[PDB]
Design a protein around this ligand. Structure first.
Ligand code: NI
Ligand code: NI
Lengths: 570, 122, 100
């Protein structure tokens, strides 16, 4: 029985070779493979396939391969690839990508993806399913920011803070075992995966290491607390012994040494460079050279992503997070000039497009936007596609390679950096069921659904007092996955191995799932996905002219962007 | 150069559903007084009793229609429907409780169908 | 006032539509949210005025045109559904392709 591709794409979603435009951007993603069998597609509804005695098996119990949730006809976009498949979720963990259904009456059904009485069906046809975004740079300032992340498909927040405190407003640091314990207790009410970073400063090992023993998932070295080489040495030693990641916010003033001194202090050890470009913070002006080292994992905050006409003017007055500046003082005005360099931002755009910068982050409420990581990532992708044109590996007029490269910048690379890749980061079997469903016209702007631990945690849903869920006002809303004790089962609180072994979750009475931070000091730049490029970056100390392999790096700012006024009221 | 957010650019050609399967064409009538819609993947020998057709042809077969679609039978009307073989282990459990096992046991299925008076059993 | 959450939510729709009308008054091209708000508020106001559900379903296709919205917006809005208090009770109004 013939079916034209249009009707098939309308009914079950685009198949092999069918391309989908991402939001209002100019990026087309083409399906590479399909795991379903034609004519045996699984769908739910009255008179549809998934029924007892039909594509749903009514014989086996829960323990006999029957899933707990099946996402049907999903369009998986992941660093692994872009392909159509059905997702099986059991016990809150992804237990299969393939063809789910009834093995008795269907062909090619994945053996562990039997649809049974315990299965709950979610129709993902016509939607793009992505892994929950990981945010490694989060200033915990406002409890309302969590929803701001959830509305943009972010499921993990890594960082420190105790609220609207000056140290928290400036640095992602939860200083001290007591504050770490208090924030860990507070995280029981946040419907999001949380990782807490401690203060990686001090001349002695013990003050830093007691924070890790208290439950810290990592360390942050900020120039506000003093980014001396002694602090870097002690923090890196503690991280190596405890197997946790260290984030560095280098010394902008170059007070205790230039970038070379910081590199010597690091001594080839694995470190995570926050806002490696420099505008957010770092060694003025040659901090971006850190992006060229194999032992450095570079990230970049969103406000400079991408290069726009208003980026230069906006960023000048937002510098007040670090310390306040007066427009008539000769020194602090000079501080502003050497901090925001348009050449560095223009080069950072291309570095992101060239796979040199590996990750993306918000660095929220501290010269960063909480709910624009994915939005600005795809805006940068579209702008670089328009300017630089298609990449070398692209083919068939599709942007599959660019999509894979840019999706890794906020899904798997942060997870690998923090060592939480074994649990979250990508849509793979055995990983936590953190999924985001986007409508293709709202992809990267508003998340249609956010499922955490196999239960829908956030939804763009309409009036709660109507006959059906669709009528206006359609807005983001917390779902049943964030209500009551369920909020303890759908979220993970990543902590250090030593804290977990010492019984910190039991001592503090934490009810959330506990994730182990591991495999952090054995990784490097080559461990990044689609962004494992190491080179030499020359930053001119005089004109800030950024050069790579002898060629200049610059781009023209764009006045208009996709994922813009077309979507947002303000 | 018109741009539409989230629009598909589908490929060329068609796609054949249930490829490489045996196909049959049977005549099905509705002798009841109410409309009857049959799903795509339901075993065809266990469909409503009021449906008149060669029930032996419905064993191990289902409607060869796009998944999620249904075939409608109005009262007092006849259609030509294409049936395709089932897949996998070829076992049917539930529905009308006619098979509850492998579909290869034909004569037992027809005996059970005639016990409850399904129309079209020889 | 004795407001159930329904009125609390629909006041936001009214405010958004008022902002959308203010923007449209100065020659601005409406995006997806302003258009959605405007058609929804038109539906609710018509229901308050006593119009039947069929009349609202008809006239919802003519409140905004293709020229009053930005590029690609009309294709984004497949349909608009609104629950409003008609004189006979609370009813659902569905307008298919309100921007032609
Ligand atoms: Ni910083
Ligand atoms: Ni920060």
């Amino acid at each position: 029985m013939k079916i034209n591709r249009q009707q098939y794409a309308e009914s079950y979603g685009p198949t092999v070779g069918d391309q989908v435009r991402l939001a209002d951007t100019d990026l087309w993603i083409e399906v590479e493979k399909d795991y379903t069998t034609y004519g045996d597609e699984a769908n739910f509804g009255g008179g549809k396939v998934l029924r007892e005695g039909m594509g749903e098996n009514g014989t086996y119990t829960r323990t006999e391969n029957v899933l707990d949730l099946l996402l049907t006809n999903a369009l998986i976009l992941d660093y692994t690839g872009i392909y159509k498949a059905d997702i099986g979720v059991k016990d809150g963990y992804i237990v299969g990508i393939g063809k789910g259904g009834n093995p008795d009456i269907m062909d090619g059904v994945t053996p562990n993806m039997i649809v049974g009485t315990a299965t709950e069906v979610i129709a993902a046809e016509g939607k793009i399913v992505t892994a929950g975004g990981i945010d490694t740079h989060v200033h915990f300032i406002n409890p309302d920011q969590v929803d701001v992340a959830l509305a943009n498909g972010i499921t993990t927040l890594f960082g420190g803070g105790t609220g609207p405190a000056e140290g928290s407003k400036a640095t992602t640091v939860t200083p001290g075992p007591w504050n770490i314990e208090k924030m860990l207790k507070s995280t029981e009410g946040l419907p999001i995966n949380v990782g807490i970073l401690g203060k990686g400063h001090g001349s002695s090992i013990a003050p830093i290491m007691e924070q890790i023993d208290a439950g810290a998932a990592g360390l942050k070295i900020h120039e506000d607390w003093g980014a001396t080489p002694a602090s870097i040495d002690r923090s890196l030693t503690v991280a190596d012994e405890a197997d946790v990641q260290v984030a560095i916010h280098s010394d902008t003033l170059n007070e205790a040494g230039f970038l070379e001194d910081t590199l010597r202090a690091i001594n080839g050890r694995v470190i995570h460079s926050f806002h490696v470009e420099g505008a957010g913070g770092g060694h003025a002006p040659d901090i971006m050279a850190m992006a060229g080292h194999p032992n450095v994992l570079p990230s970049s905050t969103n406000p400079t992503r991408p290069f726009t006409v208003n980026t230069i003017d906006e960023h000048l007055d937002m510098l007040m997070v670090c310390h306040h500046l007066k427009q008539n003082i000769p020194e602090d005005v000079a501080f502003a000039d050497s901090r925001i360099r348009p050449e560095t931002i223009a080069a950072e755009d291309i570095l992101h497009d060239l796979g040199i910068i590996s990750m993306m982050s918000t660095d929220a409420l501290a010269m960063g936007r909480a709910g624009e990581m994915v939005l600005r990532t795809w805006q940068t992708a579209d702008k670089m596609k328009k300017q630089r044109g298609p990449l070398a590996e692209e083919k068939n007029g599709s942007d599959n390679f660019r999509a894979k490269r840019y999706v890794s910048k906020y899904t798997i690379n942060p997870a690998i950096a923090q060592g939480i890749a074994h649990e979250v980061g990508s849509i793979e079997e055995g990983k936590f069921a953190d999924l985001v469903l986007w409508e293709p016209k709202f992809f990267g702007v508003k998340a249609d659904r956010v499922i955490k631990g196999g239960i829908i945690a956030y939804a763009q849903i309409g009036d709660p007092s109507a006959s059906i869920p669709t009528p206006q006002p359609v807005m983001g809303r917390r779902m049943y996955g964030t209500v009551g004790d369920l909020i303890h089962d759908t979220n993970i609180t990543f902590m250090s191995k030593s804290s977990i072994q010492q019984g910190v979750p039991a001592k503090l009475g934490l009810k959330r799932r506990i994730g182990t931070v591991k495999n952090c000091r054995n990784i490097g730049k080559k461990d990044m996905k689609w962004n494992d490029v190491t080179t030499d970056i020359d930053i001119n100390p005089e004109t800030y002219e950024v050069k790579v392999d002898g060629e200049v790096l610059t781009c023209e700012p764009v006045k208009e962007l996709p994922m813009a006024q077309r979507y947002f009221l303000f | 150069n018109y741009i539409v957010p989230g629009e598909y650019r589908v490929a060329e050609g068609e796609i054949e559903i249930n490829a490489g399967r045996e196909k049959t064409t049977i005549r099905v009538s509705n002798t009841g007084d109410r409309p009857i819609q049959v799903g795509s993947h339901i075993h065809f020998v266990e469909v409503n009793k009021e449906l008149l057709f060669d029930r032996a042809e419905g064993i191990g077969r289902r409607l060869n229609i796009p998944s999620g679609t249904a075939a409608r039978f109005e009262p007092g009307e006849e259609m030509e429907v294409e049936l395709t073989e089932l897949g996998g282990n070829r076992e049917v459990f539930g529905i009308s409780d006619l098979t509850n096992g492998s579909v290869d046991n034909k004569e037992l299925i027809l005996q059970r169908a005639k016990e409850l008076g399904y129309k079209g059993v020889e | 006032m004795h407001l159930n959450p329904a009125e609390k939510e629909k006041l936001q729709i009214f405010l958004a539509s008022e902002l959308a009308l203010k923007r449209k008054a100065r020659g601005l091209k409406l995006n997806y949210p302003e258009a959605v708000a405007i058609i929804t508020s038109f539906i609710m106001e018509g229901a308050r005025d006593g119009k039947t559900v069929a009349m609202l379903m008809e006239e919802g296709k003519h409140v905004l045109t293709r020229d009053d919205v930005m590029e690609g917006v009309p294709e984004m809005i497949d349909d608009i559904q609104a629950e409003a208090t008609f004189p006979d009770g609370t009813k659902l109004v569905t307008v298919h392709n309100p921007i032609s």
